[PDB]
Amino acid sequence: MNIVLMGLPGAGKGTQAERIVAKYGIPHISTGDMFRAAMKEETPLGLEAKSYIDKGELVPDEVTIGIVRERLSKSDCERGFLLDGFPRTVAQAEALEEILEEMGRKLEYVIHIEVRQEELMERLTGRRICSVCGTTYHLVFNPPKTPGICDKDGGELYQRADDNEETVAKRLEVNMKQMAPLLAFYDSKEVLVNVNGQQDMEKVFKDLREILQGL
Ligand SMILES: Nc1ncnc2c1ncn2[C@@H]1O[C@H](COP(=O)(O)OP(=O)(O)OP(=O)(O)OP(=O)(O)OP(=O)(O)OC[C@H]2O[C@@H](n3cnc4c(N)ncnc43)[C@H](O)[C@@H]2O)[C@@H](O)[C@H]1O
Ligand SMILES: [Ca+2]
Ligand SMILES: [Mg+2]
Ligand SMILES: [Zn+2]
């Protein structure tokens, strides 16, 4: 189960990754989550990534390819893996193809989760995360019982630094410009599958399960 989840910022990649990883027991490899964890602890990966992440720009290829190479080399990826938000450039895609061909693997599906830009803007600006447990909420789409507070543990919710409207707009632009060529690269291999991300979370997952259960 060698899978990539691709989509504009906000499309639900992390939401579906958690589902796939829970059901199929394959590692969750999210470059965004890896950068963010590094930035929080101020490691040298974090420091180098931070300026790009704050600006809504893509971290440079070599760095990104590096953390993915290191991650794939671990023994938990022998049965499959879920790459969430990588690749994001055609250079990353070609690098990955090379890494996997040496590992005697190929990508089985690249899943493009499609959502209109107005709802993406709303998803990102309204997302809130628990500072205690990391549970994600949304102001309108899945609100806590008490505003600003986690249902599970009473912890105070926070907003990511890049989820403000200005930086969301830049993120959408930056990622949309990369997208057509990346889609084409995978469509030419005929491994690209498009899923309508405007469905509820379980119905999106059900559409993914209809293909992934074959692996
Ligand atoms: N390969 C690469 N190369 C270069 N640089 C890289 C890189 N990868 C990362 N980076 C750098 O790292 C930065 C951070 O990347 P990253 O952290 O990966 O951010 P992103 O791709 O912009 O998207 P998000 O995590 O914000 O969105 P998501 O699609 O995971 O949606 P989520 O499920 O959270 O959902 C969003 C919200 O919507 C809600 N939602 C989800 N599904 C649904 C649904 N079905 N209906 C309604 N609401 C839903 C959720 O509850 C939540 O509130 C990048 O901007 C870049 O600088
Ligand atoms: Ca919807
Ligand atoms: Mg994410
Ligand atoms: Zn919590």
Curated annotation (Swiss-Prot):
Pathway: Purine metabolism; AMP biosynthesis via salvage pathway; AMP from ADP: step 1/1. It catalyses: AMP + ATP = 2 ADP. Optimum temperature is 45 degrees Celsius. Thermal denaturation midpoint (Tm) is 47.6 degrees Celsius and is raised to 66.0 degrees Celsius when AK is complexed with the inhibitor Ap5A. GO terms for cellular component: cytoplasm; cytosol. Induction: By superoxide. Zn(2+) binds at residues 130, 133, 150, 153. Keywords: ATP-binding, Cytoplasm, Kinase, Metal-binding, Nucleotide biosynthesis, Nucleotide-binding, Transferase, Zinc. It is an enzyme of class 2 (transferase). It comes from the Bacteria. InterPro entries: Adenyl_kin_sub, Adenylat/UMP-CMP_kin, Adenylat_kinase_CS, Adenylate_kinase_lid-dom, P-loop_NTPase. Its EC number is 2.7.4.3. AMP binds at residues 31, 36, 57-59, 85-88, 92, 160, 171. One of its GO terms (molecular function) is zinc ion binding. Monomer. Catalyzes the reversible transfer of the terminal phosphate group between ATP and AMP. Plays an important role in cellular energy homeostasis and in adenine nucleotide metabolism. Consists of three domains, a large central CORE domain and two small peripheral domains, NMPbind and LID, which undergo movements during catalysis. The LID domain closes over the site of phosphoryl transfer upon ATP binding. Assembling and dissambling the active center during each catalytic cycle provides an effective means to prevent ATP hydrolysis. Some bacteria have evolved a zinc-coordinating structure that stabilizes the LID domain. This is Adenylate kinase. It comes from Bacillus subtilis (strain 168). The lineage of its organism: Bacteria, Bacillati, Bacillota, Bacilli, Bacillales.
